Structure formats: structure tokens, C-alpha cells
């Protein structure tokens, strides 16, 4: 996007000042859309010495004479050329700038416009910068951030010591990764993305996107009227154990609720009977195990059952002991079908196995499982989209790294999911998503497409829960999936 | 406004290109507000070689990639610097320009953006310019004009041979006189006035304005609760004749309906009895005349009746013969009260009388009466605001020149009224307005204020008529005045 600005100026020939005017006015229009008529409000505009601050001076100058009061506090040392030009306009138009503030300044103002730092933030915020940001955050005023809330790293969404908490963020061209990943996503408040006149071809070239309703709608498979269950594919789910009997059931229904034609579970006996007592639609094959866990003695039966399906999901509730490890790795090494690998199948996975598979795979770890899989800490893998991309590319798979914002990548293309809520922060949620992904693969979507559609719909179904989200359970999530699908079109 | 552009560039230091970008985007936003989502429409943008056309190139470039198709037809010979710069951007962005058109081009397009000529129109439009404008007008496409519909003189509203008929006109900074006066007002269609970043102090310095609801609301006099009829003034109306018995009644009620405390009519006997049989609220004094018309023999009685009033209205239905002329001129010469002079009192007026009056006057001619008063043709005085200004200034009066757009001036300040409809194009309408003006003067408004408020409310009352406007009559207009007043606040 910094490249996009440069090219728009240097090669398309758009004056940098025109881009800056467009940025500033889009902030004014956004505020009006959010606050209604601006003419009764008093505005405090906090401007750094960079182009973010220059955008701020455009905002300030365009409010002059139209609102009750504008004051700029200029907090920088020097001004870039466009900031200087726009400071110069603000002052020629009759604007008041001050370079010092007292804590009390917030008193006489209703709206704070945060134009201190944008994408040019480098390093921790300290000093007077930190102090004014902490004062703004304690003030209870309406906060509108220009491009990115000051103090968020726009490439990662991390807080560099302290950051502005905004009610409204107006960003230019495209959302930045720091509006999408937490904590930055939280501090952004309501995000508007403004067109400031970059060529559309450049805006569209960005390789990391947010999954949108329109993208998911165009990916949803067709339901031709002359069809039968075989049209919509077959899934095998290898799951469960004497310890974890519920997982298979949630995974299986997850596949059925997204429109899969036939779902078969392989679950240790008698835990397999659990599934059909709850949903008799499912086929739940009993697997005879020595001690209630899959082992090498079940390898052959599982490969046999795989022959008549389009996709296999494995892992939810398997347990993690050595016999499971041997079974999972020998199975995946021989299985020549797409595989969705989750939960305990990830915990025991030998990643060499993925490199040697000819068939595709999707892996669906939470950060704890991803951390163990690559032998790093949770903090180092959490929201680490570049690590996710490298892993996907090196192992020839799709990686779905689950969190409040979920990252979906095949190594080339990376998509971010922002649907969902904390009702999914509860056992069983993941098991549903595994089934959804397998289901969409069975219906003919690529592993990446299936993952993109499933993460979006899984979170959207959660948002449709009628009562308080903290009471959402996986069973209720399942019931909501077909309403999510309907609302999507 | 050309001065306003210049000062904003040369002295405030706003780059001319920034103004042009702001103009173009405001056109895009206006079209979206009027048409909804633009993405399904095909746009033909007609660009002259001037800055109007440059505004057009900004429009075209900002639609690229976002709508179904854009084509520019460039109709000029050479380009001004800003037009050239913006043509250059349009082409760098992938835009298609052609310099020739065939009649058939309108076929493949839904919206015509008219950026051919703006305020730089000079002289009659001929040639290929005229031809494309005539084709656009026969096409039945949606027409959006940039600044002013091409072919309207923006200082007068006259059509220079031919002009674009627009559905939507987007103008910059302030409405131009040619959007306000006919025929230009008609060709403008729906007018939006966009802020493109001129300092507000400059926009507010313009000396010729449109009368708005807010201006009329703040001028409406106060009604303190501890008041009595004397608080709200007294009007004398000298009017009527054996020929024209209805005029006094409409003038009198006009004063009463705007909140005047007491209204007295002087009307030749027995025609005075007409008024109180219709509205007994009125006082209708019988004047004994020789042959049914006011004459010098009534001078003394009329001056006597004037002593106990705040304002005198004279003229509606007096007739125009020499005895009326002598009476009207001798009366106005001696009357030391504000006078509202209408109809036949204008037809007989000696304008030397106005110059020697110490007290104020409002004159309320239609173009026919103004023409006779200054000894010119109707075509030379119609919508001639500069002539109106000179007349007001030379005779120390307020002139209210009635037409579909009414001009109100005291020589220094000029206001344009755009309320009303063709239901006012009917005998009696004028008589009402005369009473309204006198009434507001009696309540304490200056002659200019009284005229401003009365023209607006008179037209607004007409718009409130429930049925077809052509059936509106003066009696119904009167009944609607207090609803207009209520809707104004």
C-alpha cells in the first residue's frame, strides 16, 4: 500500500497533495455519517509531523467555519512537505494551532481526531506522545482515528507500548493487517475504508484479504435440481475414543448441515452409538479397539472405509498416545484422498508425512496446537500470518489457524476471517468447523475455498444466536448453520 | 465566484488541481445520492476544452473500474492546464477518449455527464457543440450537468441558442444566477450546491442570495404572550373601485393572516360592504366618491385615516384614470408613513414623488407594470435584476419584481424567491401579497425584511394547496398562509 501510494504518484501522476485532500475529506464525510450533523461539535485534532498529521490538517481545515470549534495540537518536530503545505492552508484559512497541551484541554472538546501516527509508526510510543494518547483514552470523548489508531503497528496489529482506542477509524484504499488482527482490531472500533483515488487495478492486486459475504456467496456450490446424495459427496470422519465420545457427532453434523450428501463416522465401539442416538441421519460405524482408542490394528478397516468417500476428516477426540500417533501417521501416508486434519491428529502428526502425500490436506490448529506442531511458543505463532504462509507453502497444504480472527492460507493467498463471537470460545466449536470444511470439499470446492467458506459461515452462524453469546453451545451452532447459509443469499 | 476561485488559489494557496478534484468527486457523490449505486450504469462524459471539461475528466477518471462503462467525448480544440492534467490522468488510468461522435453513440449509454461549458460560456452555441446538445436533449437519457447546464449563461439564465436540459446539476460553492432565473432554472433540474473547499468567509460574502427557509424563520417576528392587537400593528389599505370590488378584501385578509393586529380598508361606497360580508373581522370604511373611483376629493379623509396606522398599502383595484393619478400622487407626497405601492397605484405613480418622500416605500410590480413604470419593454425588464437594483437605489425604495422567480432588492442587497407554483398565475394572487408585506411592516420588520418574508411565505402557501395547482384561487391561498407559517417553524 505504501507501494500503491508511490506508484499512484510517481507513475500515474496523481499529485501527492490530491491524495492527501481526498484522505482528509473522506474522514470528514465518515464522521458525518457516524455523528450526523457536525455543526454542533467541537473538534480537537492531534497532528504528528508526518503525512498522517498532514491528513489531519486537511480534516481541520475542512471543518473551519462549519463546526463550533476546531483546535489543532501539533505534536511533531518537523513537517513533511505535504504536512507543511496543509498546515500552511489551515493557518491561511484562519485555523488555530498550538504545540503544547495541558491535561485539561480535552475539557472544551467533544471529538478527538487522532492524526498523530499512521503507517509510519516505528518503535514504541513514549514521552508527550504517550501522555496525550493516555489522556485521550481516559477522556470518554468520541475518538476518530486517521488511517490506523496511533500506536497500532499496521502490519501486525500489535500495540507499540500504548495506542489510541478509537470509536471510528477511517483507512485509505484497503484495510491494513493491523485493523484485522487483535489487539489492533479491537482498538480500531468501527472501520470505514475510503476510496481516495488509487487506480482500482492497484487496490485489487493486494494478496491478503478479508473474507467477505460476497466472496463466500460466489463460492457456495450449486444445488442443481436433478441431483441425488452422490451429487453432494461423501465424507468419512475418523474420530472419538472412550474418553471423547461427543466430538464425532459434532463433526458429522457439521458436514451434514452444509449440504453434504452422506456422512460416515468411524468411532470406537460402543461410543459410535452415541452419534445415531442423537442424529440418526448419521452413519456411525463401530470400530473394535483394544482399549478404546484407534491403533494400527484399525488401519486396514479405515482405508477400506475411505475408498468409497471423497474426503476424510481425522482427529477430533482421538486422544494422543503412541498407538494413535502410529495409526494417524500410517493412515495419512497411505490415504489417497483429501484429508482434513484436526485436533489430536495434529498433536501426533509427523509433518514429513504431509510432504510425501500426493493428495491435498487442510490442517485446522488453534495456536496451542500450531505452537506444538512447529515447536514454538503460543505467543510466537499467534496471529503470525507469515509463519502460517511458510508452513502452508513448505508442507503443500492449506492451514487454517483458528482465533478470533482466523487466518486461512495456502502459502500464496491469505484470507482473514472476522465473523464470530466469544460463544465459539467453548469446547465443540472446532469439531463443527472440521466437519464443515470436509463437507464443502466433498461438494467440490478446493481445500482453500472450502476453508474460506467454512470459517466465514461458522462465525456467522454464531452471530445469529438469539440469546447471550456466552450461552452458545456447539449443538445450537449446528442448528444455526442453515440460517447462516440462507442469509448469505 | 470567478473572483472566489482566484482568491482561493492565488491568496489562500489552494492548488487549482485540488479544487478541480473536489469539484469532480462532488459530482460523483451527487449522482450516487440521486441514482443509487452507480455500478450498473454506463456513462458518456462530454468534455469541453475548458475547466468545466477538466471537471468532467475528474468525473470520468473516478468512475473507471467502478461502473459498467465510461467513455469521454472530447469536443474542444485545446485544453487548459488543469483540463490537460486531468485528461492525462484519465488516460493513464485506462480511460477511453474519442474526439468524434455519431448520433448513435447515445445508444450504448445510460447517463450523460455534461461538462461541455460552465461559467466560461461566451456567445451562442453552434456547430458540433449545438448538435451534440440537441442529440442529448432528444435521447431521454439521465443528464447530469457539471456546474451549469451547457448553453445557460450563468449570470442571466438565458439560453445562448441552445442548452442542455439536465435532470441534475451540481454547482460549486454557490448557486449561480442562471440556476435561479428562467429559463435556466428550468433546465437545471434538481440543483445540488457542493462545497469544494473555498474559505467559508468568501462563500458568505456573495451579495445576491436565494431566500431560504432558515432566513425566513429567523426574520419572523416574535409573539410575546403579554401582547394585544396594538403590539402587532395597524394597516390601512386604500383600494378598490366600482369596477374592482374584490381586490381590497384579498389585500386586507392578506395582512390579517400574517398576524397583523388591525386592518382597515378604505373602499368606495357601497363596494366597501363587500369586504365585511366575506370577512367581518375587517374594518371596511366607506369612501363617498363622485363616480366610484378615488379622487382628490378623498385626499383629506385618507390622510386622516392614515394618522392612526403604522403602514399604508395603496393600489389594488383603484383603476387608472386621471383623478386616480392626482389622488395617488398627492397622497403619497403627503403621507409620512411607510407605503406599499401596488397595481394601479404603480400605473399612475410619478416617480419624482418617491424621491421626495422621507418615509420608506415598497413597490410590487409585475413585469408589465415595471415596463410601463420605467418606459421599457417587458422583455427588457423581465428578470433584469441590475435594472431592479438601479431603480431601488435611485428612488430610495424596495422593489419587489414579481415573476416565477421574484427579485427583492433595496439597491444594495438582492434576494431571489423560488417558492410558489402556477396556481399563483391568476388574478388576486398579487393583491394577497400586498397585504402580507404591509402586515409584516406593521409588525416591525423593515420594508426589505417584510418583502423577503412575504414573497417566500406567499409562494410556500401555494405549494401547500392539496389539489391541482391550477385550481388554486386567492381565497384558498389565504386559508393556507397560517399553515405555511406553522411549517416554517
Amino acid at each position: 500500500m505504501k507501494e500503491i501510494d508511490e506508484l499512484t504518484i510517481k507513475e500515474y501522476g496523481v499529485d501527492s497533495r490530491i491524495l492527501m485532500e481526498r484522505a482528509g475529506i473522506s474522514v470528514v464525510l465518515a464522521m458525518e455519517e457516524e455523528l450526523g450533523n457536525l455543526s454542533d461539535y467541537r473538534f480537537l485534532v492531534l497532528c504528528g509531523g508526518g503525512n498522517n498529521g498532514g491528513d489531519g490538517f486537511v480534516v481541520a481545515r475542512n471543518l473551519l467555519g462549519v463546526v463550533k470549534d476546531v483546535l489543532v495540537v501539533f505534536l511533531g518536530k518537523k513537517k513533511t512537505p505535504d504536512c507543511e503545505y496543509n498546515y500552511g492552508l489551515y493557518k491561511k484559512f484562519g485555523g488555530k494551532v498550538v504545540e503544547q497541551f495541558e491535561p485539561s484541554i480535552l475539557n472544551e472538546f467533544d471529538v478527538v481526531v487522532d492524526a498523530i501516527f499512521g503507517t509510519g509508526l516505528r518503535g514504541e510510543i513514549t514521552g508527550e506522545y504517550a501522555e496525550i494518547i493516555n489522556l485521550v483514552n481516559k477522556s470518554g470523548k468520541v475518538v476518530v482515528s486517521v488511517d490506523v489508531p496511533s500506536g497500532i503497528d499496521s502490519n501486525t496489529g500489535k500495540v507499540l507500548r500504548t495506542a489510541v482506542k478509537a470509536d471510528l477509524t477511517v483507512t485509505f484504499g484497503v484495510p491494513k493487517i493491523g485493523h484485522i488482527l487483535f489487539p489492533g482490531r479491537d482498538l480500531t472500533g468501527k472501520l470505514k475504508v475510503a476510496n481516495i483515488g488509487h487506480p482500482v487495478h492497484l487496490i485489487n492486486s493486494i494478496n491478503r484479504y478479508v473474507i467477505t459475504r460476497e466472496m463466500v456467496r460466489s463460492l457456495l456450490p450449486e444445488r442443481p435440481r436433478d441431483s441425488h446424495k452422490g451429487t453432494y459427496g461423501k465424507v468419512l470422519i475418523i474420530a472419538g475414543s472412550r474418553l471423547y465420545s461427543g466430538a464425532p457427532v459434532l463433526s458429522g453434523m457439521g458436514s451434514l448441515k452444509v449440504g453434504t450428501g452422506l456422512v460416515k463416522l468411524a468411532v470406537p465401539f460402543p461410543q459410535n452409538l452415541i452419534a445415531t442416538s442423537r442424529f440418526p441421519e448419521l452413519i456411525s460405524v463401530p470400530i473394535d479397539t483394544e482399549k478404546g482408542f484407534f491403533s494400527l490394528q484399525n488401519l486396514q478397516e479405515c482405508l477400506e472405509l475411505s475408498k468409497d468417500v471423497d474426503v476424510v476428516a481425522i482427529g477430533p477426540g482421538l486422544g494422543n498416545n503412541e498407538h494413535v500417533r502410529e495409526f494417524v501417521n500410517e493412515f495419512l501416508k497411505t490415504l489417497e484422498k483429501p484429508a482434513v486434519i484436526d485436533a489430536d491428529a495434529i498433536n501426533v502428526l509427523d509433518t514429513s508425512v504431509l510432504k510425501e502425500r500426493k493428495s491435498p490436506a487442510v490442517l485446522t490448529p488453534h495456536p496451542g496446537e500450531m505452537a506444538r506442531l512447529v515447536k514454538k511458543t503460543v505467543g510466537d505463532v499467534k496471529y503470525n500470518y507469515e509463519l502460517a504462509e511458510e508452513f502452508a507453502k513448505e508442507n503443500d497444504c492449506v492451514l487454517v489457524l483458528k482465533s478470533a480472527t482466523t487466518i486461512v492460507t495456502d502459502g500464496e493467498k491469505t484470507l482473514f476471517n472476522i465473523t464470530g463471537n466469544t460463544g465459539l470460545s467453548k469446547g465443540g466449536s472446532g469439531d463443527v468447523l472440521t466437519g464443515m470444511i470436509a463437507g464443502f470439499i466433498a461438494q467440490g470446492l478446493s481445500p482453500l475455498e472450502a476453508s474460506t467458506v467454512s470459517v466465514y459461515l461458522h462465525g456467522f452462524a454464531a452471530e445469529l444466536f438469539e440469546q447471550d453469546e456466552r450461552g452458545l453451545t456447539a449443538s445450537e451452532l449446528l442448528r444455526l448453520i442453515p440460517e447462516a447459509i440462507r442469509r448469505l443469499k | 465566484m470567478k473572483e472566489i476561485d482566484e482568491l482561493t488559489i492565488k491568496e489562500y494557496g489552494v492548488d487549482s488541481r485540488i479544487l478541480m478534484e473536489r469539484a469532480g468527486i462532488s459530482v460523483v457523490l451527487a449522482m450516487e445520492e440521486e441514482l443509487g449505486n452507480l455500478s450498473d450504469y454506463r456513462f458518456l462524459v462530454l468534455c469541453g476544452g475548458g475547466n468545466n471539461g477538466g471537471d468532467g475528466f475528474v468525473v470520468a477518471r473516478n468512475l473507471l473500474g467502478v461502473v459498467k462503462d465510461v467513455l469521454v467525448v472530447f469536443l474542444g480544440k485545446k485544453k487548459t492546464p488543469d483540463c490537460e492534467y486531468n485528461y492525462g490522468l484519465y488516460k493513464k488510468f485506462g480511460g477511453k477518449v474519442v474526439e468524434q461522435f455519431e448520433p448513435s453513440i447515445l445508444n450504448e449509454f445510460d447517463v450523460v455527464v455534461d461538462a461541455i461549458f460552465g461559467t466560461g460560456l461566451r456567445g451562442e452555441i453552434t456547430g458540433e457543440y449545438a448538435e451534440i446538445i440537441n442529440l442529448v436533449n432528444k435521447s431521454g437519457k439521465v443528464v447530469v450537468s457539471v456546474d451549469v447546464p451547457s448553453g445557460i449563461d450563468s449570470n442571466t439564465g438565458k439560453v445562448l441558442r441552445t442548452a442542455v436540459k439536465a435532470d441534475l446539476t451540481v454547482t460549486f460553492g454557490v448557486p449561480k444566477i442562471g440556476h435561479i432565473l428562467f429559463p435556466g432554472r428550468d433546465l437545471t433540474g434538481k440543483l445540488k450546491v457542493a462545497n469544494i473547499g473555498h474559505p467559508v468567509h468568501l462563500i458568505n460574502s456573495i451579495n445576491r442570495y436565494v431566500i431560504t427557509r432558515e432566513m425566513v424563520r429567523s426574520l419572523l417576528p416574535e409573539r410575546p404572550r403579554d401582547s394585544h392587537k396594538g403590539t402587532y400593528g395597524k394597516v390601512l389599505i386604500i383600494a378598490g373601485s366600482r369596477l374592482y370590488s374584490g381586490a381590497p378584501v384579498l389585500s386586507g385578509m392578506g395582512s390579517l393572516k400574517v398576524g397583523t393586529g388591525l386592518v382597515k380598508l378604505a373602499v368606495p361606497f357601497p363596494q366597501n360592504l363587500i369586504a365585511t360580508s366575506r370577512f367581518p373581522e375587517l374594518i371596511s370604511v366607506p369612501i363617498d366618491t363622485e363616480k366610484g373611483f378615488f379622487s382628490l376629493q378623498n385626499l383629506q379623509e385618507c390622510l386622516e385615516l392614515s394618522k392612526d396606522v403604522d403602514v399604508v398599502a395603496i393600489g389594488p383595484g383603484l383603476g387608472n384614470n386621471e383623478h386616480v393619478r392626482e389622488f395617488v400622487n398627492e397622497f403619497l407626497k403627503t403621507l409620512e408613513k411607510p407605503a406599499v405601492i401596488d397595481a394601479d397605484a404603480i400605473n399612475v405613480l410619478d416617480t419624482s414623488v418617491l424621491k421626495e418622500r422621507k418615509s420608506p416605500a415598497v413597490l410590487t410590480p409585475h413585469p408589465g407594470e415595471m415596463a410601463r413604470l420605467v418606459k421599457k419593454t417587458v422583455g427588457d425588464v423581465k428578470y433584469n435584476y441590475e435594472l431592479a437594483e438601479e431603480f431601488a437605489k435611485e428612488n430610495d425604495c424596495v422593489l419587489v419584481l414579481k415573476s416565477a422567480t421574484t427579485i427583492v432588492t433595496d439597491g444594495e442587497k438582492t434576494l431571489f424567491n423560488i417558492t410558489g407554483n402556477t396556481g399563483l398565475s391568476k388574478g388576486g394572487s398579487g393583491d394577497v401579497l400586498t397585504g402580507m408585506i404591509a402586515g409584516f411592516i406593521a409588525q416591525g420588520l423593515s420594508p426589505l425584511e417584510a418583502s423577503t418574508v412575504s414573497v417566500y411565505l406567499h409562494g410556500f402557501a401555494a405549494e401547500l394547496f392539496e389539489q391541482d395547482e391550477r385550481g388554486l384561487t386567492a381565497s384558498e391561498l389565504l386559508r393556507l398562509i397560517p399553515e405555511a407559517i406553522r411549517r416554517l417553524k
Binding site: E32, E33, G36, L38, N62 | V193
Partner: peptide, 8 residues
Amino acid sequence: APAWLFEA
């Protein structure tokens, strides 16, 4: 009613 950009 918001009027920063347009007057009607």
C-alpha cells in the same frame, strides 16, 4: 440533517 458537502 448532515450538510458538509451539499446544500439542496
